[PDB]
Write an enzyme that holds these catalytic residues in place. Structure first.
Site, PDB file in Angstrom:
ATOM      1  N   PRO D  11      28.657  44.793   5.643  1.00  9.29           N
ATOM      2  CA  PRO D  11      29.738  45.618   6.142  1.00  9.29           C
ATOM      3  C   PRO D  11      29.624  47.091   5.806  1.00  9.29           C
ATOM      4  O   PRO D  11      29.042  47.456   4.774  1.00  9.29           O
ATOM      5  CB  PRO D  11      30.979  45.009   5.503  1.00  9.29           C
ATOM      6  CG  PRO D  11      30.607  43.600   5.162  1.00  9.29           C
ATOM      7  CD  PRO D  11      29.147  43.611   4.891  1.00  9.29           C
ATOM      8  N   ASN D  12      30.078  47.929   6.751  1.00  9.70           N
ATOM      9  CA  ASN D  12      30.150  49.381   6.610  1.00  9.70           C
ATOM     10  C   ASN D  12      28.845  50.176   6.704  1.00  9.70           C
ATOM     11  O   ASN D  12      28.913  51.383   6.797  1.00  9.70           O
ATOM     12  CB  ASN D  12      30.938  49.785   5.344  1.00  9.70           C
ATOM     13  CG  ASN D  12      32.344  49.191   5.330  1.00  9.70           C
ATOM     14  OD1 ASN D  12      33.123  49.428   6.245  1.00  9.70           O
ATOM     15  ND2 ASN D  12      32.655  48.377   4.310  1.00  9.70           N
ATOM     16  N   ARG D  19      29.616  60.035   9.262  1.00  9.09           N
ATOM     17  CA  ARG D  19      30.618  60.968   8.773  1.00  9.09           C
ATOM     18  C   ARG D  19      29.902  62.188   8.232  1.00  9.09           C
ATOM     19  O   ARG D  19      29.013  62.070   7.383  1.00  9.09           O
ATOM     20  CB  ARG D  19      31.538  60.377   7.714  1.00  9.09           C
ATOM     21  CG  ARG D  19      32.703  61.312   7.408  1.00  9.09           C
ATOM     22  CD  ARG D  19      33.731  60.683   6.497  1.00  9.09           C
ATOM     23  NE  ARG D  19      33.191  60.342   5.180  1.00  9.09           N
ATOM     24  CZ  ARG D  19      32.917  61.204   4.197  1.00  9.09           C
ATOM     25  NH1 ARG D  19      33.105  62.519   4.345  1.00  9.09           N
ATOM     26  NH2 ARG D  19      32.433  60.741   3.048  1.00  9.09           N
ATOM     27  N   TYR D  24      26.333  62.775   3.149  1.00 11.52           N
ATOM     28  CA  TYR D  24      25.299  61.801   2.734  1.00 11.52           C
ATOM     29  C   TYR D  24      24.202  61.747   3.783  1.00 11.52           C
ATOM     30  O   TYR D  24      23.893  60.689   4.338  1.00 11.52           O
ATOM     31  CB  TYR D  24      25.886  60.396   2.505  1.00 11.52           C
ATOM     32  CG  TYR D  24      26.672  60.269   1.227  1.00 11.52           C
ATOM     33  CD1 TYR D  24      26.020  60.138  -0.009  1.00 11.52           C
ATOM     34  CD2 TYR D  24      28.074  60.276   1.244  1.00 11.52           C
ATOM     35  CE1 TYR D  24      26.744  60.024  -1.187  1.00 11.52           C
ATOM     36  CE2 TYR D  24      28.810  60.162   0.076  1.00 11.52           C
ATOM     37  CZ  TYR D  24      28.144  60.037  -1.134  1.00 11.52           C
ATOM     38  OH  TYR D  24      28.880  59.927  -2.286  1.00 11.52           O
ATOM     39  N   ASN D  76      20.796  43.667   2.425  1.00  8.48           N
ATOM     40  CA  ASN D  76      21.681  44.599   1.798  1.00  8.48           C
ATOM     41  C   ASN D  76      23.091  44.145   2.152  1.00  8.48           C
ATOM     42  O   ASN D  76      23.607  44.452   3.208  1.00  8.48           O
ATOM     43  CB  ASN D  76      21.420  46.038   2.246  1.00  8.48           C
ATOM     44  CG  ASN D  76      22.377  47.009   1.605  1.00  8.48           C
ATOM     45  OD1 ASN D  76      23.344  46.596   0.962  1.00  8.48           O
ATOM     46  ND2 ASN D  76      22.081  48.284   1.702  1.00  8.48           N
ATOM     47  N   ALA D  79      29.280  45.516   0.183  1.00 11.90           N
ATOM     48  CA  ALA D  79      30.418  44.995  -0.596  1.00 11.90           C
ATOM     49  C   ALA D  79      30.463  43.482  -0.837  1.00 11.90           C
ATOM     50  O   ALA D  79      31.009  43.041  -1.861  1.00 11.90           O
ATOM     51  CB  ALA D  79      31.729  45.462   0.028  1.00 11.90           C
ATOM     52  N   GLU D 100      17.282  41.527  -2.582  1.00  8.27           N
ATOM     53  CA  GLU D 100      18.507  42.303  -2.446  1.00  8.27           C
ATOM     54  C   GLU D 100      18.220  43.784  -2.592  1.00  8.27           C
ATOM     55  O   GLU D 100      17.524  44.177  -3.513  1.00  8.27           O
ATOM     56  CB  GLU D 100      19.524  41.846  -3.479  1.00  8.27           C
ATOM     57  CG  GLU D 100      20.914  42.476  -3.337  1.00  8.27           C
ATOM     58  CD  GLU D 100      21.933  42.030  -4.398  1.00  8.27           C
ATOM     59  OE1 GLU D 100      21.637  41.152  -5.247  1.00  8.27           O
ATOM     60  OE2 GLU D 100      23.063  42.592  -4.360  1.00  8.27           O
ATOM     61  N   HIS D 102      20.038  47.823  -2.258  1.00  3.04           N
ATOM     62  CA  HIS D 102      21.127  48.795  -2.143  1.00  3.04           C
ATOM     63  C   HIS D 102      20.569  50.178  -2.105  1.00  3.04           C
ATOM     64  O   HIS D 102      19.706  50.541  -2.897  1.00  3.04           O
ATOM     65  CB  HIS D 102      22.148  48.679  -3.291  1.00  3.04           C
ATOM     66  CG  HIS D 102      22.839  47.356  -3.321  1.00  3.04           C
ATOM     67  ND1 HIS D 102      23.954  47.069  -2.547  1.00  3.04           N
ATOM     68  CD2 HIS D 102      22.512  46.209  -3.961  1.00  3.04           C
ATOM     69  CE1 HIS D 102      24.299  45.814  -2.749  1.00  3.04           C
ATOM     70  NE2 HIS D 102      23.445  45.278  -3.606  1.00  3.04           N
ATOM     71  N   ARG D 109      28.461  53.267 -10.587  1.00  2.00           N
ATOM     72  CA  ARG D 109      29.758  53.350  -9.946  1.00  2.00           C
ATOM     73  C   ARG D 109      30.727  52.461 -10.753  1.00  2.00           C
ATOM     74  O   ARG D 109      30.482  52.238 -11.936  1.00  2.00           O
ATOM     75  CB  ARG D 109      29.602  52.881  -8.482  1.00  2.00           C
ATOM     76  CG  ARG D 109      28.297  53.365  -7.818  1.00  2.00           C
ATOM     77  CD  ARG D 109      28.188  52.926  -6.373  1.00  2.00           C
ATOM     78  NE  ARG D 109      29.316  53.435  -5.604  1.00  2.00           N
ATOM     79  CZ  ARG D 109      29.440  53.351  -4.286  1.00  2.00           C
ATOM     80  NH1 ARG D 109      28.484  52.811  -3.534  1.00  2.00           N
ATOM     81  NH2 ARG D 109      30.524  53.854  -3.716  1.00  2.00           N
TER      82      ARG D 109
END
Lengths: 145, 145, 145, 147, 145, 145, 145, 145, 145, 145, 145, 145
Positions: D11-12, D19, D24, D76, D79, D100, D102, D109
């Site tokens: 997701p996302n 944006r 980024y 990836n 969330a 995995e 990221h 974070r």
């Protein structure tokens, strides 16, 4: 030196007992591969291994005065215990990538805590000796335009 | 056959801070008694003490090359802190017995946790210096069944 | 008697179920060994086993009336659950050594907790039936130098 | 259809690049995918990609991967790494090994991002190295599958 | 019996060891005072002590069949461990007051948890034997206002 | 082939107190139903209830000598407290199914932890007596396919 | 009356991922068996599997519309994570029985927690596909006594 | 020396990396100030710094043999990790004062735990270099009343 | 200036089940109330409900491209579980206000944790449907003073 | 005064709100019972209530200079929050008994922790106003030789 | 029909140190806006601020005697510490709404816990002074529809 | 006043009467010493003590308005409990130094938590009265270079 590779305690044992249990690959094999990989990008790479926390911290201070632009570190067990090492890296403010041969999440719960990972650029675990190559690949791209 | 006795940090002070705090027994006396004990079964017994974690890790690596069969170790305070020591013992795959003179369970709560005990053959705490003898006795019988 | 050996629940199983699983050594064998070791030093030794926590508490109270100088106790499962047992030993004020045949620290996390260890002179775990001999050797030596 | 490597984006990640490029970088999910396809094809390995904001879609996609002969998944999960047991049990249930990835350093974070329902079952994990993380995982995949 | 007084494990030791230093009051002294206090109010009072948890649970079952209206219990160590005891009192639905001789908040942290207190009418700890008389006084007032 | 059904403490109170309050079903009624189902399959079935942990441990040991293939246990309060019960069941190595009448997850938080469930074939909770019959059905299929 | 059986994510894999791993049975076999059992007792039974949380939640909302009396649900991984699912079941106030094929307590620590179990009538785990039939048997008896 | 000052790992970096990051002040300036301060009182003072934990343990042992009366220690990162250091100080039984340049409580949660603080005479943090002069002032008064 | 109202899972059930459970108010009523309030202030206002996490995330993304300026979100059960929802709201960087009908703090402890609240402008809970109006009031005022 | 009774915040509300809720018994009724009880034994007894923590602390410092021999305190909500109150009582070194009307263990979990109970002679909770009389009864026998 | 608005400690500082950090708005202003709003609806509104917990408690006790129907409280720092405040509100049984100017969830973790939220009708945080107005609007609707 | 010294609850008890202490020294003795040290530096210094939290918070608000440059605070027991105190010092934004006479880390575990430490410039604990002097010393250097 430009890139410094550090190995923590017990990594000198790679290959040294029962070749099948852990394969034949040695710490010196790994180093050789990395030196050659950095020579091909015309980068000077050095390496260091020790079982003594003090020597690893002294080594990081020396890296500052030598002009090292990035540390690739496999702290081994020290990931979980060494605030001193965290503070040596922050102190000299050289960016680093953390590397582990094995997947540390697959092991005992105490191995999911680190005093380094949160301050690393990034972390690579469980991809074997190739994790160091990738780390080096990343560092080369980032250091020369 | 080689057995190796390892003493961790601060064990060199046994006997030294007042006639009474736990005896006149010194580390040298203990070591001498264990040497005698092992001769009587024709076992070679090495001993080693250091305050530096790295020297202890090196000594264990060295034991692998010497064909040491079993390690008797009083890690002292390193029990509670040193993952590197755990991984050294595991990396060389030499079985061990953990010994403490005092009863670590009778003291502060942080002393109830160990990075070694779960991987030891067994543990003896609280029985003073004789704990090292018992461990030796056990080792002697487990090497020549 | 001078010394009492207590075995907790389930230890009566030793060497019944499949004598090639965990060996051909009964409680009976251990008690015999211990009785002889005690005879060698002219110490009267008593033994007791039960699966009933109340029986063990009563037996500890009886030890007080009998002038017992020290208890060697393998509480087995009761080490993790029985404050009644801790309180019987503290109530009669007879010093005790705790013994386990297996390494409790190598098992499930809940076996790391004890209601006895912190009040024991000492603990021995994981050294098999020999743990009890060691405990008796210490006890003999403390009771008559 | 058949493929050897499947790349999954959770997701996302469709938002990458879109944006305020200032924030980024300019790099998009499609950029990442193009680079991975180029790389795969250069090693004569078939590779396919999938992204969704819906958990059950990702799960369906993993079940579909079993019948397509997929040998390794580069995932990836974004969330979902912190929340999705279903995803773990999909990867496990089809017994297709995975790596995995990221883009960002998740240890840098919030504390709730330190725990994963996937990491312990992965071959390995790469975090914090941006889009190269994917490329490195493909690298590793290529060497394990066609020596 | 209208009222039943239950004493848990180890409370039979009261007054037996060196009474001049650990107190001369025995359990029998406590029972005699409560019985006289109950005769005064024309209340029938029983007493029970056991080191065995199953005996106490059986006795609580029997209390239901005897029409006991209220239980005064000092479960001693069982307050911290025995769910069985909580389900005995709850299953027979006989209201109870929990009593301890000593203040349990002042001892080890494990003694701050109870499987009974939350279901008791109330608790008295740390007032010695009078804790029992006070519970009795309250009970007498409740049963016959 | 024998199946053994064990019931823990307080289960003897079933249906005794205001049968309008928590139902009319008794423990004997549950046993009558299980024996009928077993006899219908020509399997021999034994039942046992006690409030004493020791009696249950001994009973499990006897089951070993009697050739019991499978145990259906409702440990009641013991599931939260008795490591001894865990170790008896493991030490005899007879597989077992855990039953509770009520839904233990709907009750107090401490009732959510069990010292048995992780070693059971499975668990049934909250379905009244039918839970026992389901376990028994499963067991009969397992023994005589 | 209608019973609805819901199967959560990944249960569609049953059988298909190697006979080697967990027996020969499939989701459709399970559904067939359960339809037959319900027809036998004159009850309508619908079935539903999905890998998506929202599809399950919608399905439960529909069940209210259809006047379903009881839900038999295997939430699979969603038992650990989905508050949505809990509030769907509570919102339509249809009582339900939770079912798992495997013993969740025998696996990782995170599988011991549920957002459903405490609101279920009861739970059956570790009895394989029979867990679903027992649930139906319980549900038929509730609906048509 | 009557008084010994100890600086732990990474303190040698003071004033090096960009004399605007954390000012121009250096470890040598501090030692300078403290040696002068001691001189005015006619107290002999020694100082010591190392990145190696065992060097620090060894120096504490040496201090016992030098008759040092008090230790002023800034363990730096080792305050959070080193039980070895704790047991060195307790083992030689030399009183100490712990000093930190920065407010350790203002940083990451892991920095709030110490293996030294509870056995120090007291602690000073967050008052920069003056922290050491204050400790020294206190020590001078303790030894020369 | 368009505001988007998002209702999470199960909120479509408002009113449905037995109108006396919490009265008659429906999701549609709420939306009408807010639509009118928005039109009176000349503010474009869109709404959206779904039981599917995915649809909600797709919705938030489309809100970016539609130039939505503020979101009022009642995530219902997803507040406790959905990191994906958090990351969607931060990814598009549209400020939000979190609304709940009921007081989430007065229910199960698991409802006290949220992956949304720390990133919202603020939060309103337990004021029923007026909660959403108050949020729109705040939002109107923020967007056009 | 040789005995001082302190009541903490909110106890002034006793009796006030719908005397058919928690009785018609007021704080003053209690005080009166206690004063008469104390007079019968020729002991002066003072009382004090406040909703302000500082007033309670000042009152305790006063008691020191008044030769108060024992304090009976119902700190009410302060037992869970006030270290100041703890340090007051310890500072003046007057022994105390803690009292609560209601069974504090039968309420919210945050109510099980106390900053006073470990330093009290004892505690009484759940027995209503008679708890104060019992405390006074004990106190009289303590004060008097 | 009277409403009481209570402001806890430090809220008197609103607007005082640099109107250019957190606005020019003061507590007086907020109180003014609220007294006006309440007038418009013919409700009488009282207000109160204090840095002293006991003053706030007394003010709640006073609100009961004046027939206050609802309280709007911003307890500021006391929401995390004061059970006396919780018990004042409960003990007088006046409903309340909790208000905070800032989002407490977006700040330190200790600010997540409340002694009042679970008992409030509801809670508004992070919407500035408008939160008091909204709370007032809700209260007016509930006192007089 | 350029500098304000604040003492929290119970510190009035220092000296003559004795909170069971060695020193002989009183709170006024300390104050005189501090005022003298401040006069010598030509700096103006007020002091304040109270057992009432609210009074101390008030004192801190008044300091903003009086131009106080720096606060030396010994909050005593309030350091573990009072978020209002923290929010008052942050609210007025006057830098502070926290001082304790005793070593707070040497006592009960609840005493290792502080709501002030992380926001102080620095902390001094365990050095008795001189801790305040040291802190005054520091502040003088800070306000007057």
């Amino acid at each position: 030196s430009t890139i410094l590779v550090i190995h923590g305690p017990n990594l000198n044992l790679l290959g040294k007992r029962e070749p099948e249990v852990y394969g034949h690959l040695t710490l010196d094999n790994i180093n050789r591969q990395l030196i050659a990989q950095a020579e091909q990008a015309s980068i000077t790479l050095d390496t260091f291994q020790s079982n003594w926390e003090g020597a690893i911290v002294d080594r990081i201070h020396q890296a500052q005065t030598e002009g090292v632009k990035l540390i690739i570190i496999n702290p081994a067990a020290l990931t979980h215990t060494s605030v001193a090492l965290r503070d040596a890296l922050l102190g000299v403010a050289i960016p680093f990538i953390e590397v582990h041969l094995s997947n540390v999440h697959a092991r005992e719960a105490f191995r999911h805590h680190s005093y380094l990972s949160d301050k690393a650029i990034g972390v690579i675990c469980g991809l074997g000796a190739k994790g160091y190559s990738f780390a080096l690949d990343y560092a080369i791209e980032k250091i020369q335009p």
